[PDB]
Write a protein that binds this ligand. Structure first.
Ligand SMILES: OC[C@@H]1O[C@@H](OC[C@@H]2O[C@@H](O)[C@H](O)[C@H]2O)[C@H](O)[C@H]1O
Ligand SMILES: [Ca+2]
Length: 415
């Protein structure tokens, strides 16, 4: 007799996994029916923004931690603190503190106070390598703890780049990294960032940032350890990694089901190569599961969010279906130590969460438009048509104006 709308995003395997777990929820709560609105990851932001613009908000939905403050100011998210406190034996204290705290807001700052969402997951973005490829080539395996230097990384990528079937054409490459998701680690491990410590000034014109961005573009254009521009257009590097054509490619826990189904070679996880700091860097993603401020059924809505985030049965089903690592810290630690579950070094995921992972810069700002503008016009750098130095000088004032507006608009919306 109760109906909830649950809006979310995922790759195909994730959609299937969450749809299955929602059916489990419906079995446990036969009086609640959940109507699903699901999109691809790239389509999600536009569809959720449209729902919010029309004040027709789904009862339960994924959202970006960087939107928390804005969503609170516009009364989008219900304060679910009391519903969670009164809930049957769930203890958020077993859940990653870093995850829980992204969705707390005390009226002034994120990280403390009332709960406005529950963590879907934490998403450490690790580096994978193709072990089959290394062993066929006779190249010593990467170390599981000590990062390659950038020069060492290029050296091995060059050794992996070859014509394996002897037809005269390269058909295997060291890597093929997507700047949207992998530039951050090179920037951060080189002691740079998109914005300063105060999170109010754009710093992409830092020589350290420029060096990292130029090195990144140089993998394709100068060192030539990737498929060509045309080859990547023909078949993107994610697909080429699945087919066993690339030595290195990132791995997130959300990839594991897809990789189980499609990857036939052996692969394992390693630290990212490190720049001038000598310390590896990468990001830890997260999404929140929120409840509409306007929902007619707040108890049931929070029960669904809890079932996906913290309930041992709901969580076990998600982890079993290989679309995330456990939200419970103790369960995650035991998971990582189980050698029957691959990759062998899935401990690297926890090392990222605990030690060397960072947040996206937009998690700190009121909106992310300033950062989207950096990426919007980045491709000529990546394809060698414009230098990193020339681009960041051009982009910086456009980014700064947008960041300044985010800062101001925060002041005006929180009155
Ligand atoms: O394109 C391959 C895909 O991109 C990387 O993941 C980035 C991002 O994170 C998830 O939340 C979204 O599904 C995805 O677009 C990974 O390399 C791979 O999943
Ligand atoms: Ca060939």
């Amino acid at each position: 007799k109760i109906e909830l709308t649950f809006m979310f995003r995922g790759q195909p395997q994730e959609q299937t996994a969450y749809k299955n777990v929602v059916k489990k929820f419906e079995e446990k709560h036969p009086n609640v029916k959940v109507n699903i609105v699901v999109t691809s990851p790239d389509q999600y932001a536009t569809k959720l923004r449209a729902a919010i613009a029309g004040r027709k908000i789904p009862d339960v939905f994924y959202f970006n931690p960087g939107e928390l403050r804005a969503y609170v100011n516009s009364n989008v998210l219900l304060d679910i603190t009391k519903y969670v406190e009164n809930s049957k034996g769930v203890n958020l204290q077993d859940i990653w503190e870093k995850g829980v705290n992204k969705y707390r807001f005390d009226g002034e700052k994120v990280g403390q106070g009332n709960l406005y969402g529950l963590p879907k997951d934490l998403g450490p973005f690790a580096l994978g390598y193709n072990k089959t490829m290394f062993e066929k080539a006779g190249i010593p395996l990467p170390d599981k703890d000590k990062p390659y230097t950038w020069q060492e990384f290029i050296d091995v990528c060059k050794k992996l780049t070859k014509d394996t079937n002897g037809d005269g054409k390269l058909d295997q490459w060291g890597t093929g990294l997507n700047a949207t998701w992998t530039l951050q680690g090179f920037v951060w491990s080189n002691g740079a960032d998109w914005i300063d410590e105060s999170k109010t000034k754009v710093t992409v014109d830092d020589p350290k940032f420029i060096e990292a961005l130029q090195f990144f573009a140089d993998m394709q254009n100068k060192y030539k350890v990737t498929p060509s521009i045309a080859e990547a257009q023909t078949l993107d590097t994610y697909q080429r990694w699945l087919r066993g054509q690339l030595g290195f490619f990132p791995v997130g826990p959300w990839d594991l089901a897809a990789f189980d189904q499609q990857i036939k070679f052996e692969y394992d996880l390693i630290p990212w190569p490190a720049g001038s700091t000598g310390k590896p860097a990468t990001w830890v993603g997260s999404l929140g599961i929120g409840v509409s401020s306007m929902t007619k059924h707040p108890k049931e809505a929070v029960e669904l969010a809890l079932y996906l985030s913290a309930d041992p049965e709901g969580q076990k089903a998600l982890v079993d279906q290989r679309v995330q690592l456990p939200n419970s810290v103790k369960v995650a630690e035991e998971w990582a130590k189980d050698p029957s579950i691959k990759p062998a070094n899935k401990q690297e995921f926890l090392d990222i969460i605990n030690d060397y992972g960072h947040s996206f810069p937009t998690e700190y700002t009121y909106n992310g438009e300033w950062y989207d503008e950096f990426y919007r016009n980045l491709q000529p750098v990546l394809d060698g048509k414009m230098s990193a130095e020339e681009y960041v000088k051009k982009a910086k004032p456009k980014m700064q104006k947008l960041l300044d507006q985010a800062i101001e608009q925060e002041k005006q919306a929180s009155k």
